[PDB]
Amino acid sequence: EYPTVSEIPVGEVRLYQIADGVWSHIATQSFDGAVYPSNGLIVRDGDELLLIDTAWGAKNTAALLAEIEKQIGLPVTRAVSTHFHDDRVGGVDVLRAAGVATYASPSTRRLAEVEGNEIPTHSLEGLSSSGDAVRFGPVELFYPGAAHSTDNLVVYVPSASVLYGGCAIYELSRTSAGNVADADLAEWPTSIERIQQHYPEAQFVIPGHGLPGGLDLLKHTTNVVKAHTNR
Ligand SMILES: O=C(O)c1ncsc1NS(=O)(=O)c1cccnc1
Ligand SMILES: [Zn+2]
Ligand SMILES: [Zn+2]
Ligand SMILES: [Zn+2]
């Protein structure tokens, strides 16, 4: 039942409920002649919603809001981008125009600015050092160290035992390293150890792209990252 690229036309977005008040959002983008899905997270916070990541572009992110409005009916008041790449900040200006307060770490904001990508408005303090955690309404935010990018955050929903690894965690079907141009391959496995060591209790692990699993996805990512390092 977890939505795949076969069910989703580029431009559309599917929500998938994972627990009481916890959803993933799924969108697709056309990249290098292939079609690839992407995951973000939606977490209920009283009578409002926190959004983790854009749906990878302005048009998808407009559809994401329309899909949230239709299917959940609570307002998105805050959004957090988990690193500076386009699949996480692309659509921030859409969010901002709809009244969403947009957030990222200063590291992410600076890299976004340097990259010419969209820049979330608000700064998340207290995440500058590997192993830092901060609370953010109904989630904890964790900086595990450099991995997929130097700024990548992971998000844990203490109340549903949901860990959203964003692009620092790979799905099981992904057996070769993705876009590593901005990655710290030397530190990635240590960063994942930090995630393992902080969230030993997670039950649902959502990778940046593709199918959820359990904690095995962390070891899976490590294996793939090491294989790539030994190419
Ligand atoms: O690995 C990532 O997080 C990532 N995010 C957007 S694209 C990408 N990796 S990728 O460019 O190597 C990719 C994988 C599969 C199909 N097309 C592109
Ligand atoms: Zn990325
Ligand atoms: Zn504001
Ligand atoms: Zn990605």
Side-chain angles (χ1 to χ4, degrees), residues 1-58 60-68 70-77 79-92 94-231:
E1 59 175 303
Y2 193 89
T4 61
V5 296
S6 50
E7 297 81 292
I8 311 172
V10 169
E12 277 158 52
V13 172
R14 292 291 105 74
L15 305 191
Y16 176 90
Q17 189 169 24
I18 296 166
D20 256 345
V22 182
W23 301 261
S24 63
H25 63 86
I26 302 91
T28 64
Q29 210 33 285
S30 299
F31 190 97
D32 252 32
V35 166
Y36 196 49
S38 193
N39 293 325
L41 205 72
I42 306 174
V43 182
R44 178 162 201 177
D45 184 19
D47 282 13
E48 41 194 66
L49 294 182
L50 171 66
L51 179 63
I52 308 299
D53 290 329
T54 61
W56 197 351
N60 283 353
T61 295
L64 169 62
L65 291 174
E67 188 75 350
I68 288 170
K70 285 205 285 275
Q71 199 109 215
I72 304 174
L74 270 349
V76 177
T77 50
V80 170
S81 291
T82 60
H83 67 276
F84 73 98
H85 288 152
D86 261 34
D87 54 331
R88 314 290 158 197
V89 300
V92 148
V94 164
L95 293 177
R96 181 181 302 110
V100 184
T102 56
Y103 285 82
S105 74
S107 187
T108 292
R109 289 175 84 266
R110 166 187 317 118
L111 286 156
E113 180 145 86
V114 152
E115 199 74 353
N117 292 343
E118 293 195 59
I119 306 160
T121 291
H122 287 267
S123 284
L124 289 167
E125 295 304 328
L127 288 168
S128 42
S129 186
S130 307
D132 284 349
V134 300
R135 184 243 185 100
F136 197 77
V139 308
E140 186 162 83
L141 302 173
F142 183 73
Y143 175 55
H148 170 82
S149 64
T150 61
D151 64 320
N152 50 205
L153 303 182
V154 304
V155 182
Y156 185 68
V157 198
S159 63
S161 310
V162 177
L163 183 58
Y164 168 68
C167 307
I169 305 303
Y170 284 176
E171 73 175 311
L172 291 184
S173 295
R174 186 176 210 191
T175 51
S176 78
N179 162 37
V180 293
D182 293 320
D184 188 325
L185 294 166
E187 294 303 320
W188 196 338
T190 296
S191 305
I192 285 179
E193 283 179 20
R194 296 214 181 74
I195 298 169
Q196 289 177 135
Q197 279 178 324
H198 211 89
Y199 303 103
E201 76 270 24
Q203 309 279 114
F204 208 76
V205 183
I206 311 297
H209 308 269
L211 273 28
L215 279 165
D216 281 6
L217 270 54
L218 280 54
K219 182 45 161 168
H220 171 72
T221 301
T222 293
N223 295 161
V224 170
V225 169
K226 291 184 181 193
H228 184 267
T229 293
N230 288 341
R231 62 196 183 279

